[PDB]
Design a protein around this nucleic acid. Structure first.
Ligand SMILES: [Cl-]
Ligand SMILES: [Cl-]
Ligand SMILES: [Cl-]
Ligand SMILES: [Cl-]
Ligand SMILES: [K+]
Ligand SMILES: [Mg+2]
Ligand SMILES: [Mg+2]
Ligand SMILES: [Mg+2]
Ligand SMILES: [Mg+2]
Ligand SMILES: [Mg+2]
Ligand SMILES: [Mg+2]
Ligand SMILES: [Mg+2]
Ligand SMILES: [Mg+2]
Ligand SMILES: [Mg+2]
Ligand SMILES: [Mg+2]
Ligand SMILES: [Mg+2]
Ligand SMILES: [Mg+2]
Ligand SMILES: [Mg+2]
Ligand SMILES: [Mg+2]
Ligand SMILES: [Mg+2]
Ligand SMILES: [Mg+2]
Ligand SMILES: [Mg+2]
Ligand SMILES: [Mg+2]
Ligand SMILES: [Mg+2]
Ligand SMILES: [Mg+2]
Ligand SMILES: [Mg+2]
Ligand SMILES: [Mg+2]
Ligand SMILES: [Mg+2]
Ligand SMILES: [Mg+2]
Ligand SMILES: [Mg+2]
Ligand SMILES: [Mg+2]
Ligand SMILES: [Mg+2]
Ligand SMILES: [Mg+2]
Ligand SMILES: [Mg+2]
Ligand SMILES: [Mg+2]
Ligand SMILES: [Mg+2]
Ligand SMILES: [Mg+2]
Ligand SMILES: [Mg+2]
Ligand SMILES: [Mg+2]
Ligand SMILES: [Mg+2]
Ligand SMILES: [Mg+2]
Ligand SMILES: [Mg+2]
Ligand SMILES: [Mg+2]
Ligand SMILES: [Mg+2]
Ligand SMILES: [Mg+2]
Ligand SMILES: [Mg+2]
Ligand SMILES: [Mg+2]
Ligand SMILES: [Mg+2]
Ligand SMILES: [Mg+2]
Ligand SMILES: [Mg+2]
Ligand SMILES: [Mg+2]
Ligand SMILES: [Mg+2]
Ligand code: NA
Ligand code: NA
Ligand code: NA
Ligand code: NA
Ligand code: NA
Ligand code: NA
Ligand code: NA
Ligand code: NA
Ligand code: NA
Ligand code: NA
Ligand code: NA
Ligand code: NA
Ligand code: NA
Ligand code: NA
Ligand code: NA
Ligand code: NA
Ligand code: NA
Ligand code: NA
Ligand code: NA
Ligand code: NA
Ligand code: NA
Ligand code: NA
Lengths: 7, 73, 237, 56
RNA sequence: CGUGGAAGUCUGUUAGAGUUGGUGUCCUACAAUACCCUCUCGUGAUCUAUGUGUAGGGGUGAAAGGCCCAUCGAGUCCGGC
RNA sequence: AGUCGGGUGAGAACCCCGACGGCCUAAUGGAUAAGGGUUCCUCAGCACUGCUGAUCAGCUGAGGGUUAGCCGGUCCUAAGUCUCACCGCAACUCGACUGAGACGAAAUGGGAAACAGGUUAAUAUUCCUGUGCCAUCAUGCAGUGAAAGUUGACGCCCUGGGGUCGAUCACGCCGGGCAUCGCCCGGUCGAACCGUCCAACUCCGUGGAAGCCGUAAUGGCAGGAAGCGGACGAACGGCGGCAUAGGGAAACGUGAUUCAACCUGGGGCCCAUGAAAAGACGAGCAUGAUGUCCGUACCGAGAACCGACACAGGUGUCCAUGGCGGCGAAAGCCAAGGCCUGUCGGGAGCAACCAACGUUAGGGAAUUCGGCAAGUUAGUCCCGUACCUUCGGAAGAAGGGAUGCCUGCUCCGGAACGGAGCAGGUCGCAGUGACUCGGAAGCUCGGACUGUCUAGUAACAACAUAGGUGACCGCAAAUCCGCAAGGACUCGUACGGUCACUGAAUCCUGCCCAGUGCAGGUAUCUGAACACCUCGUACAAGAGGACGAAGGACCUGUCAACGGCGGGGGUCUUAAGGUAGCGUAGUACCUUGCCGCAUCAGUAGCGGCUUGCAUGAAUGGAUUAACCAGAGCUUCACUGUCCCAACGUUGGGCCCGGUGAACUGUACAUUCCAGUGCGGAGUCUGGAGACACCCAGGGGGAAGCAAAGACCCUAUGGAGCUUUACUGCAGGCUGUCGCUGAGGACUCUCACUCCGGGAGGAGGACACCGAUAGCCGGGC
RNA sequence: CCGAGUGGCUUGCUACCUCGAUGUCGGUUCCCUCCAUCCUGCCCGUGCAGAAGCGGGCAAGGGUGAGGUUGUUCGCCUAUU
RNA sequence: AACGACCGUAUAGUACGAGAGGAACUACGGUUGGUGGCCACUGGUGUACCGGUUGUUCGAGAGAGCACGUGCCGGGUAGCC
């Protein structure tokens, strides 16, 4: 939810 | 004076602290006796280290231009 | 949105209250049936936390010990007087009627007996100008001509501690300490720096008010911010 | 400081205690009011219709 | 020249507080925010215990929509259902 | 962090004894608060629990264990809380004020009084022995004092004096250790209380300084200095008793230095002023009596608390004076005390691979987004130190030299087991020999600074700040909370405090009021309801008129108010038409702009130019010393970052004993190359390959596992937010009606309001309040 | 100029496949391949004297490197080859 | 791919050419990249080992423990490279 999974 | 402020606060600020404090720390003529022995006891409070007279005065001076006016009239 | 800061204020919570429990004395003129025979001796000069100015302790003839809004030049030993016949010297309190015109006065009553209302901050002073069997004209420190009952009592002289505003605070720490002795929330965040939800000026991609700053007097609390009922703004013209 | 496990350590304050009136450990010793029966706030017993389904 | 010992002053893993990099270790963990090294502050707008006040469109907010018991662009519980 | 013996036992790597070896030093020791709640002790056990085992245990079972006039609670009052009364509310278990009462502190606020020894498996200022003290009351004597005053009772920074424990030094005595010397370790005790001594401070007499007295420093004085005499007056300190008490196997010391505790002074700071009450004193003595009630075990943490766990996390106070070391409450090492339970072990020179880490020749940032990671430097003394600068700073700039031991000494000081130096001798590759311990310089950007922030991916240039400016308000105020009763600001009063913007200093901050906003004015125009006039209706609905509040039209003021500062020509839109500056910007599309610096080479960086896609003055412009875990760049130094990898160290990995999960699973399944297929097949088609099972590896594929895609669209879905979207609701302004009274302007006093202790004063039919009407009205 | 084509690296188009997710660009490391061949081998022509070249043919065995700016792929630049 | 490629010498200042300039076959020497192996030599490591030396503890001496898994410093065998 912040780009790369899950950053 | 404003030497305690190191290289902080800029001119005006410390220039004024020094001045005000310079005059504040001067020898002040006691209203009671005449001896130059008045010292600030706190904000607006002054006292003769000689006769012990404790009195109200300026905040940084013992006499304010305004006060000297009262006297007259 | 959410109530703006000015709205949390009214609720009178801790953060917004003055540390009253740390205040010394509700400075108010004494009462005298009449005669004026009252007078006491200055016993000490203290620091008044509520006004960052000195106040004088006094013991009266009828053994009454109370703190007094001290004018300048009042020292220990001095003898003050409070009454219609009180002498016309600095420190004494008497009805404007008995005070000579042109004399600087402080701690003036609005209604006779209220114990003083006007001119009580560091070094300020009112000015008695006109006498009359009816009205006593006093020029308050704001420069306004106030029409008062010549029966309103007032103290002679200017308030002590004058010139306190001449020295800058220099550092946040000095404000901090002073602020802590007043009924005020400090420091101050500008609306423009908040979210839209929190203040009418909040929001945007950059910081700026979303409307003209001058608000109508009739505006509801929650929306009355910025320049309240400004008759004009700026320094020009 | 995590709001999780690390903030659990300071939890050593006593609040809710065996209630003198109802016997439930709901007496807030700092508030002097029972969250269960209402002892300390209400002479009557704390009770609400929403403690059960409307038609019951 | 000396005395004096000021300071939101300096050095400082004193205590204590903080949390920059390693994008290291961990990532069915020791741990639902940890470990190690590195790093910042350390007489002040300082840090901290306990007591106390402010309650949900309301608080609190040096303002990040931050925080209000692992819950926040409107807590939690039950009810409406 | 154990090892060898041994003990107990059916059974022993981990239960116990000894020895050897280690670990912890603000803690891994000692005392405790909260919290836990029996976990404490004893005996008997091993089904459960314990990261393996167990004879062990915080486990199971049964017993036992907590003793107080003088330790806490209890009492007092703090922020503040509750109860009753009063008032509000439709009403209350609701609500602000006021009045009265009560509650509110167990480490850590105030406070009547206890010490020493002995004792138990477990308690202990509680029991026992000895000794002491307080309060109250009773009796007796004294006393008539008795309430004024003092105390309780107080901030921050610096500092002197008194002084105990401790630590160390000297010497004596007692006991131990060592074994070439003569050293090394431990001990050498002894309270509360009673009595007594008193420095500092203050004051008195004497004295009589015109220059002296005094301090670490400030200071002091003819308004009377030194000196002398005296009144008052300190320690948890000295001294005597206590004590042919107690304690010790014994000796059962004496002096000294530095001195925590404790005592007592001096100085400095505040736009900050640093609790209160009970209580004590003031106010004698003897004897006797009484002194109840509640807490008291244990843990207090890498197993007794919170975190689901015997959780590497979190969790307050006191011990800050044990030794060497050194500036040090620092490192390192070592006592006292604690521990081998940060609790599974055995085996392989012990491979690959991984985690931490050491050393790497020559080169030396070539690595890389970037020197990320690592490295370099380092303590102290001497010499010496640029630009710039707000004259403080920059600055430990930079750079250079020194540094040990041994012998004998000098100087400072009362002295230290304190400090500063001299001469001579002498070892090493190396003298801050370990440890501790900065790499340095420059250019540009940003923010002035310290400070604040996204608990859990952002610490920044973001927030704050002083400073600058504007706005509102004379207090029956402005601003704000409440439905009301009422309240914050406010124990406040324009040198105030409310509402906003900008953000140290320095030089400055141009032009525009047209639109929008705010405010002032206003002939005239527009402008609701009540009352009033006409018509209408036996009344009424209803229609129209007159008067006209705020508001609007209109006019003016205002930009450190929202914001604006162009096209065209030698005015046009719409008010003005970009001033100082700055400029290819963290703002410049074109763009790697052009020129220069620098490099072999430089989309970088810096400087100049600059027509600026689309810079610019408190939406602050320019600029700037200092500051910075902030962004970019250059240099010296340094180096395994790299050329290019090697070897080593410890923990795993691998084998063995014991313990023992989870993720995942439509089915089938030894695949590979191609093809086909809903166009990304182990399974279909054609071929190829293919004996089974097992160990280790690094992860190519199973569009691997994990998550009903956040992107995108869609749904007559949701929410937060905005506004000149729709509709409404608070709130403010204004007219009107009621309260409400006497004689389109006016007087009065009697309701009503406010000030006042009262007398009375101000105000006054207004205001407040109830009702209604018009306007404003993303505050909701 | 006009005309005929091959490829499937670029771009564009389409909306077939996956929205109960097939993890991005660039780089890196490590493996296989293609030829439309840059060098190397063998050749043809030359405006081929020689030397140095220019163009073409067969040919994929091997090779095709190091750096400066930029996240860049791309590209620009330096010195080697 | 187990081998790819380049430089140099003799050929030769020759053939060719007015000159300037300037080859080849062949035989040699070496370099580079790649490959496999090996350690006499050089180099690294070498917490085997021996020595110097700082702090501290065992009284001194002697002889040792600890300072992160060698306190630091100096030398270094085999083996592995
Ligand atoms: Cl202020
Ligand atoms: Cl207790
Ligand atoms: Cl002194
Ligand atoms: Cl090269
Ligand atoms: K998809
Ligand atoms: Mg998201
Ligand atoms: Mg007051
Ligand atoms: Mg100001
Ligand atoms: Mg405050
Ligand atoms: Mg601000
Ligand atoms: Mg924000
Ligand atoms: Mg809003
Ligand atoms: Mg701004
Ligand atoms: Mg939370
Ligand atoms: Mg500091
Ligand atoms: Mg520091
Ligand atoms: Mg608190
Ligand atoms: Mg945001
Ligand atoms: Mg047993
Ligand atoms: Mg036990
Ligand atoms: Mg109480
Ligand atoms: Mg206490
Ligand atoms: Mg015990
Ligand atoms: Mg106990
Ligand atoms: Mg454990
Ligand atoms: Mg090297
Ligand atoms: Mg490079
Ligand atoms: Mg490179
Ligand atoms: Mg680094
Ligand atoms: Mg001497
Ligand atoms: Mg730039
Ligand atoms: Mg900053
Ligand atoms: Mg964060
Ligand atoms: Mg930071
Ligand atoms: Mg961070
Ligand atoms: Mg300001
Ligand atoms: Mg201001
Ligand atoms: Mg800012
Ligand atoms: Mg440029
Ligand atoms: Mg301007
Ligand atoms: Mg702005
Ligand atoms: Mg087949
Ligand atoms: Mg979905
Ligand atoms: Mg979206
Ligand atoms: Mg919606
Ligand atoms: Mg009143
Ligand atoms: Mg809305
Ligand atoms: Mg995949
Ligand atoms: Mg071909
Ligand atoms: Mg090939
Ligand atoms: Mg060692
Ligand atoms: Mg070193
Ligand atoms: Na805005
Ligand atoms: Na001086
Ligand atoms: Na950290
Ligand atoms: Na809510
Ligand atoms: Na429900
Ligand atoms: Na004594
Ligand atoms: Na020491
Ligand atoms: Na064990
Ligand atoms: Na600081
Ligand atoms: Na305008
Ligand atoms: Na205008
Ligand atoms: Na502009
Ligand atoms: Na900082
Ligand atoms: Na290395
Ligand atoms: Na795989
Ligand atoms: Na939302
Ligand atoms: Na084609
Ligand atoms: Na395509
Ligand atoms: Na799918
Ligand atoms: Na990639
Ligand atoms: Na080839
Ligand atoms: Na490149």
């Amino acid at each position: 939810x912040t780009x790369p999974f899950x950053x | 004076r404003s030497g305690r402020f190191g290289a902080r606060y800029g001119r005006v600020s410390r220039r004024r602290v020094a001045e005000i404090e310079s005059e504040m720390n001067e020898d002040h003529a006691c209203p009671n006796c005449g001896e130059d022995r008045v010292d600030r006891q706190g904000t607006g409070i002054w006292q003769c280290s000689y006769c012990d007279y404790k009195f109200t005065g300026g905040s940084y001076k013992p006499e304010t231009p305004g006060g000297k006016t009262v006297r007259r009239s | 949105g959410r109530r703006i800061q000015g709205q949390r204020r009214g609720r009178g919570t801790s953060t917004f209250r003055a540390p009253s429990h740390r205040y010394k004395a509700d400075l108010e003129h004494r009462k005298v049936e009449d005669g004026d025979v009252i007078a006491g001796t200055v016993v000490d000069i203290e620091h008044d936390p509520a006004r960052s100015a000195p106040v004088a302790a006094v013991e009266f003839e009828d053994g009454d010990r109370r703190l007094i809004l001290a004018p300048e030049g009042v020292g220990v030993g001095d003898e003050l007087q409070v009454g219609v016949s009180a002498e016309i010297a600095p420190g004494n309190t008497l009805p404007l009627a008995e005070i000579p015109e042109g004399v600087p006065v402080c701690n003036v009553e609005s209604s006779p007996g209220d114990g003083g209302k006007f001119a009580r901050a560091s070094g300020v002073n009112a000015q008695l100008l006109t006498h009359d069997r009816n009205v006593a004209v006093v020029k308050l420190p704001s420069g306004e001509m106030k029409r008062l009952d010549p029966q309103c009592r007032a103290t002679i002289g200017v308030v002590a501690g004058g010139g306190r505003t001449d020295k800058p605070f220099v550092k946040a720490g000095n404000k901090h300490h002073k602020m802590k002795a007043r009924g005020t929330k400090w420091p101050n965040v500008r609306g423009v720096a908040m979210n839209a939800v929190d203040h009418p000026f909040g929001g945007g991609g950059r910081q700026h008010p979303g409307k003209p700053k001058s608000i109508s007097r009739n505006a509801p609390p929650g929306r009355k911010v910025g320049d309240i009922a400004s008759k004009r703004t700026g320094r020009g013209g | 400081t995590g709001a999780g496990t690390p903030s659990q350590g300071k939890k050593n304050t006593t609040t809710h205690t065996k209630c003198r009136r109802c016997g439930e450990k709901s007496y807030h010793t700092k508030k002097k009011v029972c969250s269960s029966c209402g002892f300390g706030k209400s002479a009557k017993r704390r009770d609400y219709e929403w403690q059960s389904k409307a038609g019951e």
